[model samples]
Target: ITGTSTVGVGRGVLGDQKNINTTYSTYYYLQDNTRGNGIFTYDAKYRTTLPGSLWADADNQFFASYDAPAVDAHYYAGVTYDYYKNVHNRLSYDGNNAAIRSSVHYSQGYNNAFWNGSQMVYGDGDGQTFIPLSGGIDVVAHELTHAVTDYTAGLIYQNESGAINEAISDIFGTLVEFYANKNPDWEIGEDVYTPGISGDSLRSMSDPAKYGDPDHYSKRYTGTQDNGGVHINSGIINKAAYLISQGGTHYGVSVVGIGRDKLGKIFYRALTQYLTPTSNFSQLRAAAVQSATDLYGSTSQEVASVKQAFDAVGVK
Candidate 1:
């Protein structure tokens, strides 16, 4: 949904839509289509269609048939859209009204998926080792929310901001999964891994150290690879956010799990409303603590609990 019919599809009805980044406001309505195009515009929310199935483009097993791929992409997009709007109160990537599009079977054996500047892209994995990355809702939400990051804080891609960038996606992704009722052991890409794999997820939210890797950010942790290892070093913020929300510890650090939904909202508010391009761990600490205070009160147990979790994690 781009905007309400009373607003106008591409054009703004009342006082110009706040986040008008582009002139063209392409909209999507649903699995089919809808009616109405007043000042409050409305677009197709879900489009259950794709170009083709397996592209010989890459070497994947499942042969990306048109049926399942289309189904996965559509369902995932709908879920992601709903989660953001309902949980985070975000109309789209921007709090402003804009269109969100999803493209499935992006590349053959593409094994990876990402949210490009504009839309969400997916791939058909080797099907042997992995399936299309769109196989899970968390993964879908993870990528789409990256677009949200772009529209909001635009966190720099290194050190603290970088970690915040990745952490936001991870946090929201997990909430999407939980909102969908996938419980207990939460993680990313749980659905895309081949059925025979021993793991149910790509990354562990409940237990980042489950892979036997370091949990806290450390000077000793050399992140010289993968764009300052934004993906790997992200484990620190990832784990920290998870710990603060879920209640856990790293090397005996006190973690305060505050029920996924509440923590998710706090992080989302901080990132979208309070954070800046240069936000680091310390600044993030302050923002989150402040956000919690605003939402629950300075003396609220949730505020103290979140602060304790970050402190225990050694947020420097």
Candidate 2:
């Protein structure tokens, strides 16, 4: 609907108050005209269809707890957009200002979220293992980053390439969280995962081994499940990325910290410029090394740290 850009105040899934990008014509709608062509959000209403109805409201106020998921989904999309544009000099996920779309409340007691090749789909969890997934900014950013990967590297969804893809999302998802400075940490889904439990998250970048994920290439799963263990093996690359940003030692190998901004720059350049559809772990090492060199010079500490991080993770 044609309308003037407006702001809506709401409490998100975690009960935090925030202002969301909305539109006002006859009634306020969950459509953000400020970013790209627009950032449109929809309500899935606990079903399994793609892109449900565009959320409609009578006023620009969204305060009920039931409205939390949609508000966060819509707001986080904007935040992720700003991260790409303001931080990386990219327009949108495609770098062409494509319309951003998201669907929340995906299924009954659903415990997961994903990018279904087009837009982000989120599930309101079973309330035991997970809650409304959109409540987690990192999770929201993680799912959307998959779209960015699809548009850029087009990385295959299996084995090493798939792992690289997952790690890319995790890396950026964490960065976006830090960029927002919302009690950020090196863990994914901490804000909206396992509400009954504390200090536990869906995945850990600081120590992937904490959640049964491998932190080294030697421990990688060589199986035919989970799209060749894409999610599982991503821990290796996530560890490398963590080491690159924060610096750490693993299995006698050490990497010097280069900070998060440079970490994002190196990885973003690798994804946009060097990575191919079928690039694997070894190829990622080359891409990251070259990206750091291109941005920070071959003899610079950044380039050396990139090499050391990959080596520390046994990527080579």
Taken over the whole model, the C-alpha lDDT of each candidate is 0.62, 0.94
Q: What is the TM-score of each candidate against the true structure?
A: 0.77, 0.99
**What is the clash count of model 2?**
0
**Residue lDDT tens for model 2, 147-197:** 999999999999999999999999999999999998999999999998899
* Candidate 1, poorest ten consecutive residues by summed lDDT: 35-44
Model 2 misses residue 238 by how many Å?
0.4
**Tens digits of per-residue lDDT for model 1, 1-316:** 2432221112111111111111122432222112111011111112223422211211111222442443455455666667777877777676664655656656556677777676677776777656766667777788878988888888887766777787788888888887877443467676777657866566775566665434665531455565565665566666777777768655776666788777887888798778998887788888888888889898887887777777666674
Worst 10 residues of 2 by lDDT: 57-66
CA shift of 280, model 1, Å: 1.7
In model 2, the Cα lDDT at residue 310 comes to 92
